[PDB]
Design an enzyme around this catalytic site. Structure first.
Site, PDB file in Angstrom:
ATOM      1  N   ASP A 231       0.801  -1.211   0.000  1.00  0.00           N
ATOM      2  CA  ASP A 231       0.000   0.000   0.000  1.00  0.00           C
ATOM      3  C   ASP A 231       0.845   1.279   0.000  1.00  0.00           C
ATOM      4  O   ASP A 231       1.858   1.400   0.695  1.00  0.00           O
ATOM      5  CB  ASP A 231      -0.864  -0.011   1.275  1.00  0.00           C
ATOM      6  N   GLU A 261       1.452  -0.704  -4.969  1.00  0.00           N
ATOM      7  CA  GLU A 261       0.508   0.320  -5.354  1.00  0.00           C
ATOM      8  C   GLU A 261       1.297   1.643  -5.390  1.00  0.00           C
ATOM      9  O   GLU A 261       1.470   2.342  -4.388  1.00  0.00           O
ATOM     10  CB  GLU A 261      -0.668   0.475  -4.380  1.00  0.00           C
TER      11      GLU A 261
END
Ligand SMILES: [Ca+2]
Ligand SMILES: [Ca+2]
Ligand SMILES: [Ca+2]
Ligand SMILES: [Ca+2]
Ligand code: NA
Length: 483
Positions: A231, A261
């Site tokens: 993340d 990400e």
């Protein structure tokens, strides 16, 4: 067999504590349709029971300690998650855990901290003199104690935060300590994008670095994870993420596939992240998502020949995870940019039947999104499953591309002698339907092919040379395979 990832959640997955049970129950279905790996939502205790996991409080609490007034996380208990993973594994499906390392949320208490405000558009600029604030930085884990790890967090393990409890104001606060500074390298957006939200972890602090690697190894071993989804990668020191992945691989001896990400519609910046992480991890193909979204929203006006322009899959296919939509792009969300429903099957054909990239199916597209707008994504599983079958059983062999018309584009796969009846011919159009002659391999001559999506009922016969005249309806997709 081709690999296919599934993001197994959406923004509005319910806080009923039954998501791990749902996954366990769906393991057979997912394996049947050809999913080979599942990305699960952050599995550790967030700032509250209802947090989706992206405001993590305690990475070592997978829904087993009484913290935040709950034992379970939003998704369920640790044992339920382990059961879900066991069921997936029994069906040869892998599991990738979400890793939220940028920040910590939900501190137990404030601490007195000397800080300076920084410019939101240029965090390298200090915009106040130093002053004392009360920041939410004391993380004590009262329900876990020292189980698994006796590390406690304090202000000095963070670079800054966005709230001073004293004055009750929200600013970007950079902490003063011993040689404190925003981490580098991170995205250069806003000057330095280390700071995003909550209490920002300081990846310069040697104890934090060591502790986070320890946690990563623990997390992999605890859940028997097969890989990771990182993340908010653009907000975390790149060399740290590089080393962290490597540390987990060294300890486990496992491949530990990892996708970051890195949220930026910029292929060049994505390539920089790949370089800075020694090509040891993939990235989501953000540019392809935006291209697909653009095509879906221009009512036919998009130049379909340009779908691959500026995408990661066009440049670093082996390091690309392709996707149509996710929990951040779905309706009502922070990065809202949903691919319109009519175009969604065409986008799935694009990521699932082409040879390059590791495609990811989104749970919200399969099962629908349960937000409160009058424009939620409907359940499109009945339209995506045929395309998943195209991937599993037919998308093999040499590929021929036909990005040669502003509306109607397609590609073919010749098949592989080792996959019976493999081969396909795909066509998509953002405007009026039509035809396109495409080559599917002379070894498929004389075969009767048919549209596996059912959008068209008329079969196509491959001529003696390996060419078929394929047809697509307006604003539609057809994928032809052996009848
Ligand atoms: Ca720092
Ligand atoms: Ca950060
Ligand atoms: Ca067009
Ligand atoms: Ca054939
Ligand atoms: Na930091």
């Amino acid at each position: 067999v081709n690999g296919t990832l599934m993001q197994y959640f959406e923004w509005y997955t319910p806080n009923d504590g039954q998501h791990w049970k749902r996954l366990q129950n769906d393991a057979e279905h997912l394996s049947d349709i050809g999913i080979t790996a599942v990305w699960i939502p952050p599995a550790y205790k967030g700032l509250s029971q209802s947090d989706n996991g992206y405001g993590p409080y305690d990475l070592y609490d997978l829904g087993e300690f009484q913290q935040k007034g709950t034992v379970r996380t939003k998704y369920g208990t640790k044992s339920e998650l382990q059961d879900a993973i066991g069921s997936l594994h029994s069906r040869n499906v892998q599991v990738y855990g979400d890793v939220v390392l940028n920040h910590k949320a939900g501190a137990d208490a404030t601490e007195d901290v000397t800080a300076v405000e920084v410019n939101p558009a240029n965090r390298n600029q200090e915009t106040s003199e130093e002053y004392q604030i009360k920041a939410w930085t004391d993380f004590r884990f009262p329900g876990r104690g020292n189980t698994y790890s006796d590390f406690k967090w304090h202000w000095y393990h963070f670079d800054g935060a966005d709230w001073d409890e004293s004055r009750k104001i929200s600013r970007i606060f950079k902490f003063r300590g011993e040689g404190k500074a925003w981490d580098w390298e991170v995205s250069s957006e806003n000057g330095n994008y280390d700071y995003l939200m909550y209490a920002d972890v300081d990846y310069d602090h040697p104890d934090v670095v060591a502790e986070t690697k320890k946690w990563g190894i623990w997390y992999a071993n605890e859940l028997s994870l097969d890989g990771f989804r990182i993340d908010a990668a653009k907000h975390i020191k790149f060399s740290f993420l590089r080393d962290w992945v490597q540390a987990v691989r060294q300890a486990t001896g496992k491949e530990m596939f990892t996708v970051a990400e890195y949220w930026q519609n910029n292929a060049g910046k994505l390539e920089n992240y790949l370089n800075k992480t020694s090509f040891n991890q993939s990235v989501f193909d953000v540019p392809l998502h935006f291209n697909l979204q653009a095509a879906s929203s221009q009512g036919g006006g998009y130049d379909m020949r340009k779908l691959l322009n500026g995408t990661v899959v066009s440049k670093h296919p082996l390091k690309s995870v392709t996707f149509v939509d996710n929990h951040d792009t779905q309706p009502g969300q922070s990065l809202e940019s949903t691919v319109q429903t009519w175009f969604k099957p065409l986008a799935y054909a694009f990521i699932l039947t082409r040879e390059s990239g590791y495609p990811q199916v989104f749970y919200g597209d399969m099962y629908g999104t349960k937000g409160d707008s009058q424009r939620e994504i409907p359940a499109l599983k009945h339209k995506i499953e045929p395309i998943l079958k195209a991937r599993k059983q037919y998308a093999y062999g040499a590929q021929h591309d036909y990005f040669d018309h502003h509306d109607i584009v397609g590609w073919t796969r010749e098949g592989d002698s080792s996959v019976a009846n493999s081969g396909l011919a795909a066509l998509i159009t953002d405007g009026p339907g039509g035809a396109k002659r495409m080559y599917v391999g002379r070894q498929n001559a004389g075969e009767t092919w048919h549209d596996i999506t059912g959008n068209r009922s008329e079969p196509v016969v491959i001529n003696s040379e390996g060419w078929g005249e394929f047809h697509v309806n307006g604003g539609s997709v057809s994928i032809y395979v052996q009848r």
